[PDB]
Amino acid sequence: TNANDLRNNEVFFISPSNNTNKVLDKISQSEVKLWNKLSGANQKWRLIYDTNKQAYKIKVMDNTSLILTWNAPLSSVSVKTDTNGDNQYWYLLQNYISRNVIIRNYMNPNLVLQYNIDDTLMVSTQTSSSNQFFKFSNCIYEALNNRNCKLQTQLNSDRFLSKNLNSQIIVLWQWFDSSRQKWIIEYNETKSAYTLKCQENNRYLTWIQNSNNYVETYQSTDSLIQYWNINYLDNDASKYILYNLQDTNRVLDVYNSQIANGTHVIVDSYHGNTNQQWIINLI
Ligand SMILES: CC(=O)N[C@H]1[C@H]([C@H](O)[C@H](O)CO)O[C@](O)(C(=O)O)C[C@@H]1O
Numbered sequence: 211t212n213a214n215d216l217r218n219n220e221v222f223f224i225s226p227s228n229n230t231n232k233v234l235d236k237i238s239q240s241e242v243k244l245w246n247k248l249s250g251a252n253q254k255w256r257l258i259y260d261t262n263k264q265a266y267k268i269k270v271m272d273n274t275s276l277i278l279t280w281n282a283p284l285s286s287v288s289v290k291t292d293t294n295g296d297n298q299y300w301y302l303l304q305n306y307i308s309r310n311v312i313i314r315n316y317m318n319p320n321l322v323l324q325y326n327i328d329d330t331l332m333v334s335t336q337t338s339s340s341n342q343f344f345k346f347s348n349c350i351y352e353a354l355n356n357r358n359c360k361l362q363t364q365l366n367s368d369r370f371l372s373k374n375l376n377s378q379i380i381v382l383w384q385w386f387d388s389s390r391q392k393w394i395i396e397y398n399e400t401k402s403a404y405t406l407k408c409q410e411n412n413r414y415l416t417w418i419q420n421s422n423n424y425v426e427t428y429q430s431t432d433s434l435i436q437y438w439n440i441n442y443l444d445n446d447a448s449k450y451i452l453y454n455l456q457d458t459n460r461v462l463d464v465y466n467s468q469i470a471n472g473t474h475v476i477v478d479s480y481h482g483n484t485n486q487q488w489i490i491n492l493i
């Protein structure tokens with residue numbers, strides 16, 4: 211699969227290649243090390259690419275603007291405030307067959323991240339050993355692919371993404387445990403995005419393009435309007451934004467931020483407001 215590829219804006223557990231059950235963990239306001247996977251936001255890392263440098267910032271999800279930082283000239287690594295220092299940039303490059311990634315420092319490309327015997331971390335020169343190979347696993351894919359889910363608007367604790375009765379239109383509605391409010395999330399490799407299938411009629415969350423821009427359940431299609439990028443809110447791993455693949459500046463949006471049963475769900479320009487923020491949970 212290509213679901214765990216090093217796409218920009220995506221969020222990952224970063225593991226040693228020798229153990230998928232240990233992951234990179236912001237332990238203190240400064241210290242990082244490999245740790246048993248428990249999935250708090252301290253163990254989730256967002257990639258922020260820099261096309262000019264062809265390198266990435268690796269940013270922890272729990273703290274505003276702390277990014278993985280080489281403490282030059284020392285051999286240690288920490289998380290520190292983002293100041294766009296060259297020592298805070300990393301080439302991430304993948305072996306296609308093993309899936310292993312080398313995490314190489316931008317400031318000094320002789321040096322690469324390595325995991326020590328006691329699972330602490332450091333930068334060091336590259337030697338063949340497996341102590342410099344990491345696996346990246348996309349958090350959302352690993353949590354949500356092939357799962358039956360419900361989607362709650364952040365506007366209100368009991369208003370959910372719902373196919374309307376005897377219509378194709380999708381609206382907000384309070385929970386009544388209906389198959390109309392149940393959505394199976396499936397990744398598609400050709401689109402590098404997800405479809406969401408209503409359990410009631412086995413049809414898909416789709417942007418219907420006209421003056422109203424309603425989302426509706428629609429038959430299976432290869433058109434981009436049926437595909438969604440599911441990502442965490444910019445600085446919050448409890449909340450999600452869903453971009454439509456037809457136009458990745460547009461997102462799943464509650465019309466006029468109304469909360470009333472039956473309020474239309476639409477596709478609208480991104481602003482990051484509460485009406486474009488969703489809580490996704492397994493049923
Ligand atoms: C999301 C959804 O399907 N809502 C439907 C509700 C619920 O089925 C009902 O509240 C169950 O308690 O019923 C209606 O109001 C109705 O019967 O006229 C139509 C509406 O589309």
Ligand SMILES: CC(=O)N[C@H]1[C@H]([C@H](O)[C@H](O)CO)O[C@](O)(C(=O)O)C[C@@H]1O
Nearest residue numbers: 217218219439440441453454458459480
């Ligand atoms: C608002 C936002 O994120 N826009 C970005 C989208 C989304 O990240 C994507 O729809 C969700 O994965 O990705 C890009 O198209 C990309 O990564 O090349 C860049 C674009 O600026």
